[PDB]
Design a protein around this nucleic acid. Structure first.
Lengths: 25, 127, 91, 97, 214, 153, 81, 97
RNA sequence: GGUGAAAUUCUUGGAUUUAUUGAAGACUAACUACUGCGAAAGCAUUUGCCAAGGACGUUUUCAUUAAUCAAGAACGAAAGUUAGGGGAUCGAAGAUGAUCAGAUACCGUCGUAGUCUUAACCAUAAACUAUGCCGACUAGGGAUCGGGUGGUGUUUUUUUAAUGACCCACUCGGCACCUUACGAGAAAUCAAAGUCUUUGGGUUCUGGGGGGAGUAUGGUCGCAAGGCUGAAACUUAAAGGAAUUG
């Protein structure tokens, strides 16, 4: 797949992981 | 040394408008659109509609009192196209044939001195 | 030393009322308790005794000003408009 | 424009800064010229002008406040009016009036 | 079913004295019916028409002049200068690559009520025997010309109403001063007056209008 | 107290007797104690003066404008607010004006109104912050605070 | 090109070149002695202006400054000294 | 330790200039790229020139021209307008005809 | 209206349509170019004020003051965010009518955020000549922007004076270009990517097969969105760059 959309795919999952980790803290 | 008029040919893509008027402007006589004569409605800007209606204009125009007519020429302009439509030439020749004398002509398109965003999107119209 | 990092004058409210509100207030409280310069005596002696009223400490003139500043933006432009609009009638 | 003149004047001939001193100078006859600030008050202005018309001293109105009139004359304090007693190296008498 | 085209009463509008001939406008509006008399209805309207039609000289096809009505005298009325333009195509002919365009204006006053804007224009020619294709202006000389031209625009008006103005306009003797003043500053070419229009209209004033018969 | 716009105590000489009769406008922004205040028909268009609405141009900012001739203040009398005269209707001497809501109005040219904005603009820019401040604001107005919600009772 | 002498070139192919890119660097600025209109005595002046010079005794304008060489006003004779 | 990757190829311009939308299809485009043509034609066609001249009041008449500058988006230029595509050598040449 | 064609749509509770005015924002057309400035990002209407800067001129002065630069710092498109204003066109979302097997996509008709501006933030971009900066030296050729020099040159007034504008020759500093390759290069191409196996003029920064990954974690800046700094296990024989046919 394309790089521009890959970037977005990363980003969305990163700010999911931000909530997932910050549920504990 | 005879009576005059003015035509003002607004010929666009997908419609043609040529409505002769009095020398002042407000006193109109016969509107005649592109879609009046023919009833196909994809041929709104076609030659045969514009030549048909151009005689019809002169019919109602002779019925009051018009001999000569100036022929100012216009387009949609502004943001859009700013280039004359298909049926303008169809009109011009047709009205020049059907009875009337022909006065002076010039361009009167609404040409902007740059203005507003054009309709379509940045990446543009595509198919 | 330099006593606090960011609150400044709004640290009197302390922990409360929400950050965005505190900052929002601070934005004004600086201007409210600013010593402004007089238009007449030309010293840094103008304060306010109630919002709207702006006093000169020496000189002792009192100018009608804004809520939290002496010359609020809208006022500043109004005078200029009037200043300009007087030059069509007279000269 | 005018600052350039006063910079030269303030370090060659001689001058005076204040109000009382200016009045004194004006009384005696030494006053060649006065520079009144724009901000300085109307009563004081008119007063100075009245002396000026009697001593026949040429009157100049500065385009700037008292802070500015200090800035011009190379002084780190305000000065509502500056009266001149001797135009030394410069020639500020006939350049303006 | 109505037939409202023919019931309108016929009419004609004539030009002012300061041109050459009066016979121009032949129009219709409406009959003087119950409410809305056509005498006062048509006053606001104007006619844009070529100068060659009312000058008796076919060389001036460009410049279509605008004329507004005020008085009515038995369906054979007199009219007074409203505005002017050049023809759109003429400007586009004037506008070329490999040269510089210079446009300017000023809100000059006449002797009376009439206050207006007048838009001047100039271009830069391939002077005499240039080898280079363009001959561009300097660009301090563009603004320095704009100043001289502006001055000319100013001092040539504050004169006797539209009477002197229109007179100057018809053969454009304004151009000569613009030419010989600018000649030393920059070669130049064309030099016309694009537009003139009334920011401040007249107030009625029948004395100026009706004292212009043949 | 109970009006964020500060007041302006002005003193004229009565024409018809030797005395100083005092009036009290809502102070327009940029006035100072011992500024002169010119009033009436041929007053200057300087901030503080009270001219009839025919005498001003259009685009003009006034405040405290009367609804009709000689009612002594009516519109734009709040802290910060102001009207904008946006054209004459010189026949049957009215003038068309821009009220601080947005909505328009047609009123006599003989209705006076005072030049400029009103002081204390940007009063409501600050948050009231703590209930106490609100209480303090309201106890100099009336007893419409605090307000219990109907859905509770 | 290829083989030539740069020590002794020609005045033709050197006076054309820039002041800095000659063999020995030298200015293109002679000194001129102007005889003014008023007085009979001379005024020794540098060919390039910088400032607007007036006469020695009877103070009137001699030569105005430009982008390069001095603009000597009116009919006034001069020398190369 | 440390290890990764890539990048690519080239062409020339100037700095930045504002765009002018496509006269046909409303795509945005600068003026170094541009692709422009001068539409310079009479109002009348070759067929219309006689029919008019015959019906013309005024001797000599006029017959002006509709002038306008048309800007394309490269995509649309190849769709119709004179641009097409040239060889390895011919794409260096700048002469029109 | 609107397209490839249809529809949505609005229509004598006069629609689209010409002429006379007004209101609001909008953007500086055409001229506008292998044209101009800025450190870049980026900047085109007039006029004024405020400082600033290049080149040029210079028998002016200063006298190695300098070249680049980890840290640290100003600016930094567009889109975003914060609270006001402004809120016309165009228009993420959205609603829609078509299209099609499906269409929440392309085509249409509207339309909230935005586009504009005030004060704050934000720091990324194919921020592109994906070509560090300073210095020197090497091939020709014209054309052009900005000074400068000279010529009994031409042109323009008041024949003539002065400038300007031209023409010619020349020289400095640029935006660049045309022709060769003298050289360089894997080629494409390059007057610099040259003067480098006959390998060293000064200096900063970055890369060491592809992925995993510009991810994880930890710091740090940010209101947030994100930004800077930045691995590992594990996996794999090619990824790739130019050209060559087909």
């Amino acid at each position: 797949m394309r790089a521009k959309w890959r970037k977005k795919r990363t980003r969305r999952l990163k700010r999911k992981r931000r909530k997932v980790r910050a549920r504990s803290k | 040394s005879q009576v005059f008029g003015v035509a003002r040919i607004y010929a666009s893509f997908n419609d043609t408008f040529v409505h002769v008027t009095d020398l002042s402007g407000k006193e109109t006589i016969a509107r005649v659109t592109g879609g009046m004569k023919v009833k196909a409605d994809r041929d709104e800007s076609s030659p045969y509609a514009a030549m048909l209606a151009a005689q019809d204009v002169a019919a109602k125009c002779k019925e009051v009192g018009i001999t000569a007519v100036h022929v100012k020429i216009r387009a949609t302009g502004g943001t859009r196209t700013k280039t004359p439509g298909p049926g303008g030439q169809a009109a011009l020749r047709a009205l020049a044939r059907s009875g009337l004398r022909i006065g002076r002509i010039e361009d009167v398109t609404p040409v902007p001195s740059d203005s507003t965003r054009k309709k379509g999107g940045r990446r543009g119209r595509r198919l | 030393a330099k006593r606090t990092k960011k609150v400044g004058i709004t640290g009197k409210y302390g922990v409360r009322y929400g950050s965005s509100l505190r900052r929002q207030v601070k934005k004004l409280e600086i201007q409210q308790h600013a010593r402004y310069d007089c238009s007449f005596c030309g010293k840094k002696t103008v304060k306010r005794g109630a919002a709207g009223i702006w006093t000169c400490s020496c000189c002792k003139k009192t100018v009608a000003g804004g809520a939290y500043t002496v010359s609020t933006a809208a006022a500043a432009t109004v005078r200029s408009t009037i200043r300009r609009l007087r030059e069509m009638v007279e000269a | 424009s005018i600052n350039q003149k006063l910079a030269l004047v303030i370090k060659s001939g001689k001058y005076t800064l204040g109000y009382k001193s200016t009045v004194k100078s004006l009384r005696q006859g030494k006053s060649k010229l006065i520079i009144i600030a724009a901000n300085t008050p109307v009563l004081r202005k008119s007063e100075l002008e009245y002396y000026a018309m009697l001593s026949k001293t040429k009157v100049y109105y500065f385009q700037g406040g008292n802070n500015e009139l200090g800035t011009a004359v190379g002084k780190l304090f305000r000065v509502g009016v500056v009266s001149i007693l001797e135009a030394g190296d410069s020639d500020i008498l006939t350049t303006l009036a | 079913v109505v037939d409202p085209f023919t019931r309108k009463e016929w009419f004609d509008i004539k030009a002012p004295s300061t041109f050459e001939n009066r016979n121009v406008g032949k129009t219709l509006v409406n009959k003087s019916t119950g409410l809305k008399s056509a005498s006062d209805a048509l006053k606001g309207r104007v006619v844009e028409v070529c100068l060659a039609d009312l000058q008796g000289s076919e060389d001036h096809s460009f410049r279509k002049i605008k004329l507004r009505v005020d008085e009515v005298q038995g369906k054979n009325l007199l009219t007074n200068f409203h505005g002017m333009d050049f023809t759109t195509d003429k400007l586009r002919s004037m506008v070329r690559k490999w040269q510089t365009l210079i446009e300017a204006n000023v809100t000059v006053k006449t002797s009376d009520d009439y206050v207006l804007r007048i838009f001047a224009i100039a271009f830069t020619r391939k002077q005499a025997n240039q080898v280079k294709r363009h001959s561009y202006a300097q660009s301090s000389h563009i603004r320095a010309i704009r100043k001289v031209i502006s001055e000319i625009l100013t001092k040539e008006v504050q004169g006797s109403t539209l009477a002197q103005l229109t007179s100057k306009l018809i053969p454009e003797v304004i151009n000569k001063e613009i030419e010989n003043a600018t000649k030393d500053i920059f070669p130049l070419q064309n030099i016309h007056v694009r537009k003139v229009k009334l920011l401040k209209q007249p107030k009625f004033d029948v004395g100026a209008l009706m004292a212009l018969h043949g | 107290s109970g009006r964020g716009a500060p007041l302006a105590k002005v003193v004229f000489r009565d024409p018809y007797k030797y005395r100083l009769r005092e009036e009290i406008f809502i102070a327009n922004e940029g006035v100072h104690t011992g500024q002169f205040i010119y009033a009436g028909k041929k007053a200057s268009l300087n901030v503080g003066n009270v001219l009839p609405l025919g005498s001003v141009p259009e685009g003009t900012i006034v405040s405290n404008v009367e609804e009709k001739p000689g009612d002594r203040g009516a519109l734009a009398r709040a802290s910060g607010n102001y009207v904008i005269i946006i054209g004459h209707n010189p026949d049957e001497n009215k003038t068309r004006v821009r009220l601080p809501s947005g909505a328009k109005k047609v009123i006599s040219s003989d209705a006076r109104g005072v030049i400029g904005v009103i002081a204390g603009g940007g009063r409501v820019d600050k948050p009231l912050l703590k209930a106490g401040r609100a209480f303090h604001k309201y106890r100099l107005k009336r007893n419409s605070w605090p307000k219990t919600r109907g859905v509770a009772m | 090109v290829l083989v030539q002498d740069l020590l002794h070139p020609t005045a033709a192919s050197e006076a054309r070149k820039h002041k800095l890119k000659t063999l020995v660097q030298g200015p293109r600025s002679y000194f001129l002695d102007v005889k003014c209109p008023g007085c009979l005595n001379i005024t020794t002046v540098f060919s390039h202006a910088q400032t607007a010079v007036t006469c020695e005794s009877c103070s009137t304008i001699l030569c105005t400054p430009t982008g390069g060489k001095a603009k000597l006003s009116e009919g006034t004779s001069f020398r190369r000294k | 330790p440390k290890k990764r990757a890539s990048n690519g190829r080239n062409k020339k311009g100037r700095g930045h200039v504002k765009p002018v939308r496509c006269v046909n299809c409303s795509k945005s485009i600068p003026k170094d790229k541009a692709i422009k043509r001068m539409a310079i034609r009479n109002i009348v066609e070759a067929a219309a020139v006689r029919d008019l001249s015959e019906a013309s009041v005024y001797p000599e008449y006029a017959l002006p021209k509709t002038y306008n500058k048309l800007h394309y988006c490269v995509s649309c230029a190849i769709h119709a307008r004179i641009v097409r595509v040239r060889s390895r050598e011919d794409r260096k040449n700048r002469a029109p005809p």
